[PDB]
Amino acid sequence: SGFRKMAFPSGKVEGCMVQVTCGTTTLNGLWLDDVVYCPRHVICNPNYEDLLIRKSNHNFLVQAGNVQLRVIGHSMQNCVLKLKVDTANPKTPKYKFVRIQPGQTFSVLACYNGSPSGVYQCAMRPNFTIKGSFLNGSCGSVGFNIDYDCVSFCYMHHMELPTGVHAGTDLEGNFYGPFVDRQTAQAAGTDTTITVNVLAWLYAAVINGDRWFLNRFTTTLNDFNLVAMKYNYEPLTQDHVDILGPLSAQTGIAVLDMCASLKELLQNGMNGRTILGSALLEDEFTPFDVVRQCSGVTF
Amino acid sequence: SGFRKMAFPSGKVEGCMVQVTCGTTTLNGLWLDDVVYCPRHVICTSEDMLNPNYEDLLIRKSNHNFLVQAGNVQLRVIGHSMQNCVLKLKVDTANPKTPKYKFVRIQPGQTFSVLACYNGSPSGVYQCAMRPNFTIKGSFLNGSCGSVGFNIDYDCVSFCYMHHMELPTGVHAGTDLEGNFYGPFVDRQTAQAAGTDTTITVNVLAWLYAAVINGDRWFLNRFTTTLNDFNLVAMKYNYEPLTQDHVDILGPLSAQTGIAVLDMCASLKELLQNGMNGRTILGSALLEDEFTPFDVVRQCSGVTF
Ligand SMILES: COc1cc2c(NC(=O)Cc3cccc(Cl)c3)cncc2cc1F
Ligand SMILES: [Cl-]
Numbered sequence: 012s013g014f015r016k017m018a019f020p021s022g023k024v025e026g027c028m029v030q031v032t033c034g035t036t037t038l039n040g041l042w043l044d045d046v047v048y049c050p051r052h053v054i055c056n057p058n059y060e061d062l063l064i065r066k067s068n069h070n071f072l073v074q075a076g077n078v079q080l081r082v083i084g085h086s087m088q089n090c091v092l093k094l095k096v097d098t099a100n101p102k103t104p105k106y107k108f109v110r111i112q113p114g115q116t117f118s119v120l121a122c123y124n125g126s127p128s129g130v131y132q133c134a135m136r137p138n139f140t141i142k143g144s145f146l147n148g149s150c151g152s153v154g155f156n157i158d159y160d161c162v163s164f165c166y167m168h169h170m171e172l173p174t175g176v177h178a179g180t181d182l183e184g185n186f187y188g189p190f191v192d193r194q195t196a197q198a199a200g201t202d203t204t205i206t207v208n209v210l211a212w213l214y215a216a217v218i219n220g221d222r223w224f225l226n227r228f229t230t231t232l233n234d235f236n237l238v239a240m241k242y243n244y245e246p247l248t249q250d251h252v253d254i255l256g257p258l259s260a261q262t263g264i265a266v267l268d269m270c271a272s273l274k275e276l277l278q279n280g281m282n283g284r285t286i287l288g289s290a291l292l293e294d295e296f297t298p299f300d301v302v303r304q305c306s307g308v309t310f
Numbered sequence: 311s312g313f314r315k316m317a318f319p320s321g322k323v324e325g326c327m328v329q330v331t332c333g334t335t336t337l338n339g340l341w342l343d344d345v346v347y348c349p350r351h352v353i354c355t356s357e358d359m360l361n362p363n364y365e366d367l368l369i370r371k372s373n374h375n376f377l378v379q380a381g382n383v384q385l386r387v388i389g390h391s392m393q394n395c396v397l398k399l400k401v402d403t404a405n406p407k408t409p410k411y412k413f414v415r416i417q418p419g420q421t422f423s424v425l426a427c428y429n430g431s432p433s434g435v436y437q438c439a440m441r442p443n444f445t446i447k448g449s450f451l452n453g454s455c456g457s458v459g460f461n462i463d464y465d466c467v468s469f470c471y472m473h474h475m476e477l478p479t480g481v482h483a484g485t486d487l488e489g490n491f492y493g494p495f496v497d498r499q500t501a502q503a504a505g506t507d508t509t510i511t512v513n514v515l516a517w518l519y520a521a522v523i524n525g526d527r528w529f530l531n532r533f534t535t536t537l538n539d540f541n542l543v544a545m546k547y548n549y550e551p552l553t554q555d556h557v558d559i560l561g562p563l564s565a566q567t568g569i570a571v572l573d574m575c576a577s578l579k580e581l582l583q584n585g586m587n588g589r590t591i592l593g594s595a596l597l598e599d600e601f602t603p604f605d606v607v608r609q610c611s612g613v614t615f
Contacts, residue, residue, distance in 0.1 A: 013449035013450055013482070017426070017435065018317060020324050022432075121316070142312060142593070144314035289595075291595045304449060309432065310432060310433060
């Protein structure tokens with residue numbers, strides 16, 4: 012019993028964190044094999060190819076623990092800088108670089124000066140921002156998921172927006188969202204609630220003995236989406252319905268029956284009650300996170 | 311900016327998790343140097359759990375009855391002893407991944423990270439607090455026994471909890487790493503229940519200071535209170551009494567934000583009376599009590615917004 016916001020064990024990622032210094036700027040890098048990946052703004056209207064050509068290998072100071080790494084080459088891929096080093100990381104795990112979709116969750120290992128300080132779970136919001144916990148020096152901290160023994164790197168931290176939310180790239184340097192890496196007027200778009208995730212979280216509450224919000228009613232997908240659009244909820248697709256299939260069979264509550272419960276909660280509120288110790292509808296647990304936490308899958 | 315429930319990086323702890331099997335029971339152990347620490351109920355049957363005589367059960371076991379597995383490698387048990395509710399298995403190999411560590415017994419209100427394991431394999435990490443009734447609200451399934459709670463101070467791992475059992479309400483009970491239970495619980499299948507729980511007042515205050523540091527002041531008021539009057543009001547909402555120690559502990563946060571501790575107590579009194587009125591504090595519609603004053607100072611900035 013119990014339902015917590017749970018992150019993946021961070022050990023395989025901790026062994027990859029390094030400190031990267033260039034001039035006055037100091038941030039974090041990801042050391043995999045003989046390459047260190049970090050945000051290209053470490054070299055900072057910035058013409059990045061023009062600023063990079065002026066730099067030489069010895070301008071980049073890389074520190075792995077108490078050991079200095081020797082930079083032997085450098086290249087840029089989109090908004091990521093790739094520093095070729097002399098030593099291959101002996102702690103390199105089996106890994107992939109993956110691009111996630113909004114609504115998908117991941118673990119963040121927050122670092123300062125190449126040293127990991129914390130791990131937390133979060134989701135890629137529909138507006139492509141993440142609600143993280145980051146201070147100055149956190150740039151280069153990474154987002155990941157673990158699938159069996161393979162680490163899938165999905166996010167690298169680049170910046171904080173004026174509302175306190177965060178923006179970054181995949182490990183190939185492509186930003187999530189209509190953001191750019193530079194000091195300019197940038198704002199997050201209007202956010203929405205991840206509907207498939209709230210439904211998964213309602214199924215997790217049923218599994219844990221919270222059935223007060225269930226009713227005898229069902230709905231149509233069309234009628235549910237007309238109601239969900241009024242509350243700034245993401246549209247629910249037939250793919251989302253198919254994805255919730257296992258949870259529906261386990262609890263005996265069909266997705267459109269649970270949708271009628273969500274509809275009543277949106278129009279009436281909680282009435283002094285909580286669901287899994289929360290007075291808000293939680294949208295940062297995917298259907299796979301619910302199944303994984305309510306089955307005990309190990310890494 | 312931002313405020314998340316943050317756990318410590320788990321790597322130093324992952325390298326200590328092993329699987330311990332005795333007969334039909336399989337649970338987790340903590341391998342530090344040449345000793346594996348695990349709950350003593352690993353020697354029990356489900357029948358035995360009603361009134362186990364652990365000393366009588368242990369005297370009948372030999373070293374080779376305990377199967378210890380570290381990854382895909384079998385460890386050889388060369389000795390065994392019991393310390394309170396923990397079994398200590400002497401093994402023939404020292405853990406090369408043993409970090410710098412301490413065994414610490416915490417007090418209610420304290421927070422820590424939990425590395426939940428099944429079959430000696432870590433599956434997840436989460437942050438939680440020792441409740442005033444000595445239970446923890448964890449996320450644990452069958453086979454999680456032996457999972458540990460820890461804090462990482464500088465580069466030293468302070469082990470404070472080992473998971474032993476789930477109570478009928480879904481909450482969890484366990485021991486420190488010396489085998490002493492937190493709370494009036496026993497590692498027995500007798501009728502036990504968690505006492506009525508209360509809110510950790512000093513932690514909610516720390517969390518209100520974290521919201522002020524992050525730029526949110528809507529909940530503040532022009533009033534103050536005496537400590538006695540605050541406690542008379544707090545007791546009516548099932549809040550833990552606030553002591554002079556708690557007031558002293560909140561001193562740094564008070565100096566940083568410019569709000570006196572008893573003035574922050576006055577905002578809390580008003581929040582308890584009025585509710586949130588459709589508003590949130592740090593993305594929460596409830597008053598959060600699982601961030602200590604030390605956690606707030608660690609995660610938040612040194613400059614108030
Ligand atoms: C078999 O069902 C579960 C067991 C769990 C568990 N194990 C025990 O409670 C075993 C036990 C029994 C009686 C006294 C003691 Cl000391 C220990 C620990 N945590 C979570 C659990 C969740 C479960 F669903
Ligand atoms: Cl303590």
